[PDB]
Symmetry: C2
Subunit: 386 residues, 2 copies
């Protein structure tokens, strides 16, 4: 049974965040720009704005315009947005965030996807949207028990869609949400209209002849991963081994929680100089505040521990089980991993949609809502012609 | 010029630590023992003892019985203990900690090393001790500028010993202190009586015939490293890429700083169930408080960034430059890396002392002061016979 939910942060918690922000003990660090983490000049000014200018209550209102629910599945609380189109025949779609994600990434796409008529679009392009928070993340709240490996998440998701009455839906996502959607392919193929992933990593099989078949451009695309592995993989390594330790390090300092996530907003998102290049500052702070207020820094960190075998820091080699479900792929230029189509085609036998976009990074929908919407609309048009 | 120094933590800073401790926002985490970080039951009780029972002023007094100084070398403040033996002909020795080290590791060995006569030892075994804090660590205070690669540390150390009037000394250490001492071998061989390392990692060269020459036991010893690399390397990976981020995550929460270092006291030290198995709790909290009070969590983290090329997460392969300086090696069973003698002999041409101890981990002197003292005494006796 679905229990109506609204975000309502107690006033005392907001007061506590402001107190902690003004009392931050700022470290003495050398100025090397963003090279070793957020520079003091940037993070201090942002932290001050976070305290003095950011309007949490307004952000809370913007989120609460969307119907939300919580339900219990397999021993965990799951929070989700459920936004019905005014078109009854809209195509159901579950959009799943990854780490460090929240449904707030998707505020800018919800309107256009669910109500295209009101956004100058074709009413035939409508979706009904389900936007859940991963177990242990943000509004789903912290975990009371562990063991949430990918297959368990996928099983949960199929139960959710089934109990909402959706017998045919699209599974969409990036990062953890991409894996979840891909696993839905094996777990719930009879109810899956299609899978769409906006972040795809393609592994070499490890078999001899494969490399020779790749062009210089394919190989360069595979080597893109080297930036993440060398420079950006620290948080994933920490979370895949000691997520509790990360918890202690995020839960008791707002600036710690800020500084940690600024890494993704600077480098995972596609930026030039600052996070604001890619994402609106108030949206970013909304996203970040969710983690802080829900105190799920540590519980969310558990996901990397649970998904260790799937981590690119664990292995970049090996065929995935074959997948016959209609599939769409979107390649964002700033994505940390870049898929090679022929490697993708090796395992995924019904890729019906392959799009290469010219801007946007890791948080694709969040960074480039219009591109993302146009893309998903095109994909669904293709599905309907099958 | 050497400026007399004493540790004197302002009372307000102690009051601030107690306030922050009682106001800790404890994360909701599942109970999986130590598997994913410090369990809540352990860290909460320790944090309460830290606030209510631990006597910082007493720890401060114990440290201040040793003459200390600060001096400026190559643009950085260096703090050091300087403990002269009552034997004027004692052998000078510089003992260098690593990460996450402090001179407090050595309180239990200072007396026996400098004044063996008073400790039932032979006065001929005496050392004069120099015990510096690495640039950016603890009592040396945070860095105002970066660029502190190993060679720069070694150059600094040779300048320090020279200006203290020591024309012949032993360089001793583990971890960063081991590398520093080994580099002193190339940088200051005319003033080096010998090098002693209590943590030695031995790299394969990468050359063909080498593996065949190793016994099953040698190979098993090389594979010991797998525990560190798989399970314990997160903090080093984070610090080698984003030490500022780590800074923000340690500087504004005592419990964060506690939880982070508990990793080393649990797993790097040789324990069975708890840190207290290996190290006295009050000594541990003294060590940990140093980082907190000096606010050098972030500045110390810089060392992994600066020493990236030397990191075992970076490379485990390649010959080191040949070294002809008289060398001593001590192998502690709980050390994270275990040296193979024949690999050591490959590069180090005058190993005169090789000892295999039966207890103790990473913080060898701290965990097993009597073994460590007996070992260094034996080593120096060997040097004198050369």
């Amino acid at each position: 049974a679905m229990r109506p939910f609204q975000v309502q942060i107690p006033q005392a918690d907001i007061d506590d965040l402001k107190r902690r922000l003004s009392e931050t003990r700022w470290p003495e660090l050398v100025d090397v720009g963003w090279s070793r983490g957020a520079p003091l000049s940037y993070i201090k000014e942002l932290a001050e704005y976070w305290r003095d200018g950011f309007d949490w209550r307004a952000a809370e209102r913007r989120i609460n315009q969307y119907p939300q629910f919580t339900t219990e599945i397999d021993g965990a609380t799951i929070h989700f947005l459920h936004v019905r189109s005014p078109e009854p025949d809209a195509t159901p779609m579950v959009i799943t965030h990854g780490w460090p994600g929240t449904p707030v990434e998707f505020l800018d796409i919800i309107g256009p996807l669910t109500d295209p008529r009101a956004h100058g679009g074709d009413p035939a392009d409508a979706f009904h949207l389900v936007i859940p928070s991963l177990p242990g993340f943000g509004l789903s709240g912290p975990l009371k028990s562990a063991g949430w490996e990918l297959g368990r998440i996928a099983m949960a998701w199929s139960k959710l869609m089934a109990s909402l009455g959706y017998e045919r839906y699209i599974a969409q996502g990036g990062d953890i949400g991409a894996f979840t959607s891909l696993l839905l392919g094996a777990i719930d193929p009879s109810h899956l209209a299609g899978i769409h992933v906006n972040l795809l990593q393609t592994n070499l099989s490890g078999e001899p002849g494969e490399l020779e078949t790749l062009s210089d451009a394919d190989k360069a695309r595979l080597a893109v991963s080297e930036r993440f592995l060398d420079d950006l993989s620290g948080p994933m390594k920490m979370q895949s081994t000691r997520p509790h330790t990360i918890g202690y390090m995020l839960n008791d300092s707002p600036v710690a929680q800020l500084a940690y996530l600024l890494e993704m907003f600077k480098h995972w998102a596609q930026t030039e100089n600052v996070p604001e290049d890619a994402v609106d500052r108030d949206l970013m702070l909304t996203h970040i505040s969710l983690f802080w207020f829900t105190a799920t820094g540590g519980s969310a960190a558990q996901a990397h521990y649970e998904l260790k075998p799937f981590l690119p820091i664990t292995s970049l080699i090996g065929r995935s089980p074959t997948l016959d479900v209609p599939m769409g792929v979107a390649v964002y230029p700033g994505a940390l991993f870049q898929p090679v189509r022929s490697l993708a085609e090796r395992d995924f036998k019904q890729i019906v949609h392959w799009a290469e976009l010219d801007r946007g990074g890791h948080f694709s929908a969040m960074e480039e809502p219009d591109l993302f919407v146009d893309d998903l609309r095109t994909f669904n048009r293709t599905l309907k012609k099958l």
